[PDB]
Amino acid sequence: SMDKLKKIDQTIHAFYCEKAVISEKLNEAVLYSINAGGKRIRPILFLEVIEALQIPLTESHFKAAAALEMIHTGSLIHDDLPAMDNDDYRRGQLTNHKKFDEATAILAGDSLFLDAFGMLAETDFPTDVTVDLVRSLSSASGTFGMVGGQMLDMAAEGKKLNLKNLQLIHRHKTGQLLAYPFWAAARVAQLDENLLATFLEIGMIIGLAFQVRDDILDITAKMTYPHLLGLNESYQILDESLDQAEAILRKLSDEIAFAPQKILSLIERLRLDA
Amino acid sequence: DKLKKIDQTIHAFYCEKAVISEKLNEAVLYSINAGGKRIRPILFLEVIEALQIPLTESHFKAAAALEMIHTGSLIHDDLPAMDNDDYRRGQLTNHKKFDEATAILAGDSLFLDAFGMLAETDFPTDVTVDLVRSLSSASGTFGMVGGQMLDMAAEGKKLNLKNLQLIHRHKTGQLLAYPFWAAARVAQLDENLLATFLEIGMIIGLAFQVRDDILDITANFEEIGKTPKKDVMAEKMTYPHLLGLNESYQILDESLDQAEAILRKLSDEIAFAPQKILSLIERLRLDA
Ligand SMILES: C=C(C)CCOP(=O)(O)OP(=O)(O)O
Ligand SMILES: C=C(C)CCOP(=O)(O)OP(=O)(O)O
Ligand SMILES: C=C(C)CCOP(=O)(O)OP(=O)(O)O
Ligand SMILES: [Mg+2]
Ligand SMILES: [Mg+2]
Ligand SMILES: [Mg+2]
Ligand SMILES: [Mg+2]
Ligand SMILES: [Mg+2]
Numbered sequence: 001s002m003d004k005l006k007k008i009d010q011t012i013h014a015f016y017c018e019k020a021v022i023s024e025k026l027n028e029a030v031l032y033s034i035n036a037g038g039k040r041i042r043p044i045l046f047l048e049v050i051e052a053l054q055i056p057l058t059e060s061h062f063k064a065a066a067a068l069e070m071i072h073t074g075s076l077i078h079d080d081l082p083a084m085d086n087d088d089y090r091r092g093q094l095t096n097h098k099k100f101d102e103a104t105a106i107l108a109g110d111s112l113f114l115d116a117f118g119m120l121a122e123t124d125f126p127t128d129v130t131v132d133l134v135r136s137l138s139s140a141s142g143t144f145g146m147v148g149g150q151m152l153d154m155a156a157e158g159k160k161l162n163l164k165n166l167q168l169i170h171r172h173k174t175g176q177l178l179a180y181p182f183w184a185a186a187r188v189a190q191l192d193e194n195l196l197a198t199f200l201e202i203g204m205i206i207g208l209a210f211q212v213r214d215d216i217l218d219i220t221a222k223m224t225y226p227h228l229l230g231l232n233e234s235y236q237i238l239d240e241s242l243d244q245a246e247a248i249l250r251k252l253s254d255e256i257a258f259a260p261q262k263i264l265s266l267i268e269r270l271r272l273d274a
Numbered sequence: 275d276k277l278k279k280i281d282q283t284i285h286a287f288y289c290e291k292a293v294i295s296e297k298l299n300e301a302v303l304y305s306i307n308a309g310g311k312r313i314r315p316i317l318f319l320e321v322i323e324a325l326q327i328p329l330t331e332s333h334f335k336a337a338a339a340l341e342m343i344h345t346g347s348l349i350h351d352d353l354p355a356m357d358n359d360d361y362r363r364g365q366l367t368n369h370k371k372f373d374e375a376t377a378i379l380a381g382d383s384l385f386l387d388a389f390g391m392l393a394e395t396d397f398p399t400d401v402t403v404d405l406v407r408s409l410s411s412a413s414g415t416f417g418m419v420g421g422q423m424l425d426m427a428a429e430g431k432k433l434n435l436k437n438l439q440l441i442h443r444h445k446t447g448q449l450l451a452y453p454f455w456a457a458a459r460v461a462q463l464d465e466n467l468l469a470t471f472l473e474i475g476m477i478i479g480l481a482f483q484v485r486d487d488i489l490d491i492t493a494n495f496e497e498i499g500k501t502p503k504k505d506v507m508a509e510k511m512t513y514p515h516l517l518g519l520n521e522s523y524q525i526l527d528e529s530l531d532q533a534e535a536i537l538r539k540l541s542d543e544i545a546f547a548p549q550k551i552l553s554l555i556e557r558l559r560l561d562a
Contacts, residue, residue: 022420022444025427030415071386078382083374102355103426106378110350110422111415113382114343117389118410127399134406138390143302143383148294151379155297172294 008043009034011059011066015119029100029108030115033073036093041210042181043069045266049185049199052260060123064133064188067120068181071141074112077105079150113141125188132187140176149173156223166228170211171204178210179203195256202248206267209241213270235274242267280315281306283331283338287391301372301380302387305349306341309363309499313482313554314453315341320551321457321471325544332395336405336460339392340453343413346384347449349377351422357504364499385413397460405456412448421445428511438511442483443476450479467544474536478555481529487512488522488560523562530555 012034016027043065050061080087080095081102088098097105120137123130139145149172156169182203186196215224216234225234246267249260284306288299315337322333352359352367353374360370369377392406411417421444428441454475458468489498490505491514505512513522534555537548 016415019416022416022440023423023427026415026420026423074382078378081375081378083378103353104423106350106353106355107419107423107426110346110381110385111419113385114410114414114419116410117406118414121403121407121410127403130403130406131393131399134389134402135393138386138388138393142386142390143288143298144291144294145386147379147383147386148298151295151298151376154375154379155295168294 004044004047005040007062008040008066008069011062011119012070015063015066015115015122025100025104026107026111029096029104030111032099033077033096033108033112034070037091038069038073040069041266042072042177045178045203045206045263046181046185048263048266049182050188052258052263053185053189053191054257054259055189058124060125061188063119063123064125064184065181067116067137068177068184070112070116070119071137071146072177074109074116075141075146075150077109077112081105084154129188129190133184136183136187137180140180145172145176146174149176153223161223163228166223166225167208169223170208174211175204175207178207182206195252198248198252202245205241205245205248209238209245209267209270212238212241213272216272235272238272242271276316276319277312279334280312280319280337280341283334284342287335287338287387287394297372297376298379298383301368301376302383304365304371305345305362305368305380308365310341310345312341314344314449316554317450317475317478317551318453318457320554321454322460324547324551325457325461325463326547327461330396332397333460335391335395336397336456337453339388339409340449340456342384342388342391343409343418344449346381346388347413347418347422349381349384353377356422356426357508359501359504361495361500364496401460401462404459408455408459409452412452416444417448418445421448425510430509431511433511433516435516438513438516439480441511442480442513446483446486447476447479450482451475454478463544470536470540474533477529477533477536481526481533482558484513484522484526484529485558485560487514488519488526492519519562523560526560530559 016031021027046065046068047057047061051057076090077096079085080090081097087095089095096108117134120134121130141147149169152169153173179200180203183196183200186199212225212234215226216238219226225237246264249263252258253260288303293299318337318340319329319333322329348362349368351357352362353369359367361367368380389406392409393402395402413419421441424441425445451472452475454471455468458471487505491503493502495502513525534552537551540546541548
């Protein structure tokens with residue numbers, strides 16, 4: 001009903017504006033990175049799986065979605081730093097450290113990480129649900145998730161590596177937090193164990209597809225699919241990953257009260273053509 | 275020994291899961307193992323014990339989470355764009371031992387991992403959610419990171435006592451208040467008791483930064499494990515810079531006195547044995 005993008009941004013603004021401000025500059029810097037566009041694929045997938053499962057959307061679903069986006073946004077800020085990829089622009093816009101300075105951007109990223117779990121604990125979900133969501137969000141973001149993947153992507157700089165090493169980087173650097181929204185929606189829906197596993201499986205496939213798509217675009221728009229396998233095979237892997245994800249979603253819809261059309265449409269907009 | 279077990283708990287979190295990056299685990303564990311007084315996690319645990327609750331592995335995990343955020347804050351605080359120290363805890367800072375990128379990510383890990391650690395306890399789930407909300411509140415934009423920004427923005431500025439307190443209560447106060455509040459929450463105490471423990475923690479937390487400011491300009495490298503007098507070169511707003519050393523020593527001493535008096539008063543209102551906590555506060559006292 002209400003535009004999900006607008007509501008997600010309003011949820012985020014409300015978190016920063018509802019409490020007595022301590023540092024105006026910190027709030028400003030954090031919101032700069034939030035308001036600097038973003039397709040919001042991660043929170044949108046969470047919300048769309050919730051609706052697909054016939055659950056009416058509430059304030060709390062938007063907060064859980066927002067928590068996820070805050071972690072994603074924080075990782076981008078740090079990834080751009082001079083000590084990291086040292087980029088002056090993300091999406092044709094000044095990166096945080098260039099808009100402000102290096103110390104501000106390090107702290108803005110730290111805030112988004114730490115704040116996200118506060119956003120997530122503000123929901124009205126049953127408390128056992130919230131605890132699992134926190135555990136899994138940490139697992140997907142930290143030393144055994146996104147941060148680990150970031151370290152391996154650095155550790156990788158040194159070498160040609162095989163498929164196994166490329167998949168290891170992607171799985172953790174990006175795969176985990178693209179899969180989280182699928183698993184998390186299913187957990188909020190209180191689905192049984194094997195359904196949770198299926199939803200996580202979809203998410204990992206979509207995470208893979210998203211990273212292969214990235215690699216293909218970044219050379220039509222080092223340690224990548226096109227470099228490792230060539231373009232032809234990269235296109236093939238993207239296409240069969242999306243097919244595979246779509247087939248599992250359709251099979252669920254033939255088995256439980258699940259209406260994934262909007263998800264299937266979102267996935268269809270990721271496709272690339274020769 | 276609590277020190278030993280806190281470290282054991284952090285080690286197990288990192289070693290008992292399948293490693294993704296050996297260099298990340300190495301960088302994180304480097305800063306942990308370089309040292310630290312563990313005042314925060316120890317305070318949490320001593321409150322629990324003072325309230326007559328036998329310690330369990332779950333209390334140590336909650337304590338560890340708190341130390342993990344603390345350690346993350348130090349790694350970032352030491353960075354060249356922040357306070358730029360080559361030394362922390364007697365050893366090379368993370369960014370000098372490895373590199374700046376590694377230090378950034380190691381700090382990030384610690385922050386994100388800490389909530390995972392906290393979520394692994396066997397506490398009732400409403401308790402855990404309360405601790406998560408309050409730990410985030412103490413640590414983030416409205417706590418420690420908020421105070422870190424104020425501290426950087428105040429360099430070279432002539433600020434008043436109110437502004438200085440704001441910096442200190444947020445960058446340092448929040449995460450020393452948290453362990454008192456948190457232990458009382460775990461203990462399931464009533465509202466006015468939670469507030470009393472929070473107040474003891476805010477008193478101790480502000481005093482701790484007064485103490486740190488003092489040490490910065492009076493202690494030697496071997497004593498503080500970090501490069502002396504950075505506050506002077508950087509023109510930080512500090513208690514000695516605003517009020518002078520003499521009044522700063524006075525404030526520290528009387529703040530510690532107040533915290534102890536409230537703790538002693540609690541012991542004739544509920545079942546509470548504060549001796550180890552009082553002992554710990556006594557080790558914080560400074561002489562001019
Ligand atoms: C976890 C994150 C932030 C992914 C960063 O990966 P890259 O560094 O390869 O991606 P872009 O900067 O091109 O987004
Ligand atoms: C002053 C602050 C808040 C940072 C250092 O805290 P500690 O003095 O507790 O440092 P470690 O013992 O943990 O090294
Ligand atoms: C969150 C932190 C680090 C508060 C203490 O600030 P300082 O910068 O004075 O701490 P030290 O580096 O002197 O330990
Ligand atoms: Mg990168
Ligand atoms: Mg990058
Ligand atoms: Mg500092
Ligand atoms: Mg410092
Ligand atoms: Mg200091």
